[PDB]
Amino acid sequence: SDLKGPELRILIVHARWNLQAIEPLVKGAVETMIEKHDVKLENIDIESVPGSYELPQGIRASIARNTYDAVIGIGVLIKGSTMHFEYISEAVVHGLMRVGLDSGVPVILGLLTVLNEEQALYRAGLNGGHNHGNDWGSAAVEMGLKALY
Amino acid sequence: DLKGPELRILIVHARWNLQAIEPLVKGAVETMIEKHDVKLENIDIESVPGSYELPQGIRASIARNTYDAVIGIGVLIKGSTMHFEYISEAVVHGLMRVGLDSGVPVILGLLTVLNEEQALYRAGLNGGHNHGNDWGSAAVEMGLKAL
Amino acid sequence: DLKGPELRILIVHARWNLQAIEPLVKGAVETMIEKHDVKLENIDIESVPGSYELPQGIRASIARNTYDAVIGIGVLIKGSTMHFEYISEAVVHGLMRVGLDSGVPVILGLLTVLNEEQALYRAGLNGGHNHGNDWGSAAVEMGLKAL
Amino acid sequence: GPNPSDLKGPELRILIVHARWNLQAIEPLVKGAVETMIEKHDVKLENIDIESVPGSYELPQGIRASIARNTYDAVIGIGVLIKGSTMHFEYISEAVVHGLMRVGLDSGVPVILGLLTVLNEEQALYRAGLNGGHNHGNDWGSAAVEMGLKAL
Amino acid sequence: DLKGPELRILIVHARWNLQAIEPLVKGAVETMIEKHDVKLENIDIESVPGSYELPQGIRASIARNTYDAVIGIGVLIKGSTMHFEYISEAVVHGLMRVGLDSGVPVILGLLTVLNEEQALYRAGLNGGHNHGNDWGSAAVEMGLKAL
Description:
The first copy, chain A, is α/β, with parallel strands linked by helices. Helices cover 49% and strands 19% of the residues of chain A. It is classed as transferase.
């Protein structure tokens, strides 16, 4: 991917629960968009919400106020002792998807739904894993461009 | 650190299983007033028979009055049949919908546990952490960010 | 202790497995009349072939007449195929929808059980508690709150 | 135990959309649906439209397109899904059932679920009335009629 | 027997796991051309990063141009987390929606397998049958019936 998007406006909305993993993901996304796709730091809006359940709601509210070419919803869900994990994981995933089709703005799913901390960190590039935030960054640019031209 | 003295919050809770509901509603209210400067007279508390009416009750309410954020509280416990499985999913997807359709933030105060003990623990009893507190702060934050 | 003598309630029940449906419909009606002062003339009872037509039947009816609350009653029992799993989800999500789209409360009177015995028990037979009673009371409350 | 009706609907227009995958089971069902509507409910052969699609995934899409062109009083979506080696079964079964349900509520036209979601071929045939089973197409036909009438 | 020389087909495929995507896209195209008389110049082929963008991509494309039928191709393989389970469902439900909202047929060219071998087999490799072929014929049929 040699796609450059210097006029793209990207929005990043991440939950704040479990930051040991969130930060590396958000960081990876931003760095990849800037260093590999020529996106301008000043054209990247980063916002946060309490948890993953608010990801769709927060993204929906934001794309109504400003104009973005692509959005990235980042969050981490870890299986617990109850059925909570099962039910909101599904609700959020179906939710983001909806906000995207309703608004016409691309929504990248930066949602990790893991069984334990270790799996989440590994996917954030720690302990020899690959940072998925990088992939989401590149995806956002591609969808942003294809959404225009 | 986030103060919201002009916010109007709505809390709708089911009435089924009150040993857990009360602590949750109370924690939510206390946290909003004591930590976020929300005014007691700006908090409306309503109830419905069960969790299945949560979406329907919240929808009806935000159509009559104007709220900045809403909290849906209820407790679901796995039983002998497949009821738990199906309505848990329906309610979670339903509250989520009302939130996106109306544009009003809907905090999910629904506990979907396997037994009574897990419910109480998450209500702050028996050495657990009261989630109603987290929901209170969340409602304030979403209320403010929504403008 | 909620009285609703001017309420108009609609009950739509599937006809599949009547050993359990009847007790439920009867419990619902009795409870509304004897404990909430609802008038027999004000309760409309309709039926559909099966649970899959519950949302469709309810939607059609609330388009012709005006009701304050509705109750969808039906019984689903796990069979040998995956049929149970799939239409149970569809119906629960579907009634939920008709309720939010129309603005009319829709009480879920749907039992999703593993066998006949579980269904009857929840119909108040063999020492169980009749859930139709709970649904009747719910219908009233939601009806009034909808004002 | 399913309780039927002795309802007559000679002015009803019924549409039947079936997938073609696995016809050993589809035919009996379609045939049962049709015969039952004609012989027991007085529906007129000319008032029954029968269309088909490649597979069950196109059932909602096909029905939607058709009820936009013509006017029907009730629709029946017929199809057969059998658990395979992958997760395909699980996912499209759910998608289709939710899908037909939607088309029915959006359009206001009754949609009968003639979808069999079985674990093997045997279970499908049995429910198609073969090998001592009960033909479900029959039940769907009566359902279509009833919903059609109540819809007025 | 079904020829559609005036049909305009759209193919949108994810780029993840190309060892399987190519055979499928190839089979789809060949079958439409060699068996249904579709004209190569009337087949638009586009791509997206992953399966999650499939609905989003298709939606954007059928808004710019007019197609008679669409095919969404992608491959999802169970992993170590719950990711597979959740997006598989989301994408299948999403493509379905785009189809019903737009009125344009959307063929499901999404494989949801447990391992690489299963995907390749269904791509016609190792003695399996290429499903891309079936999707191509399907697209043609739906395109025509849609008129």
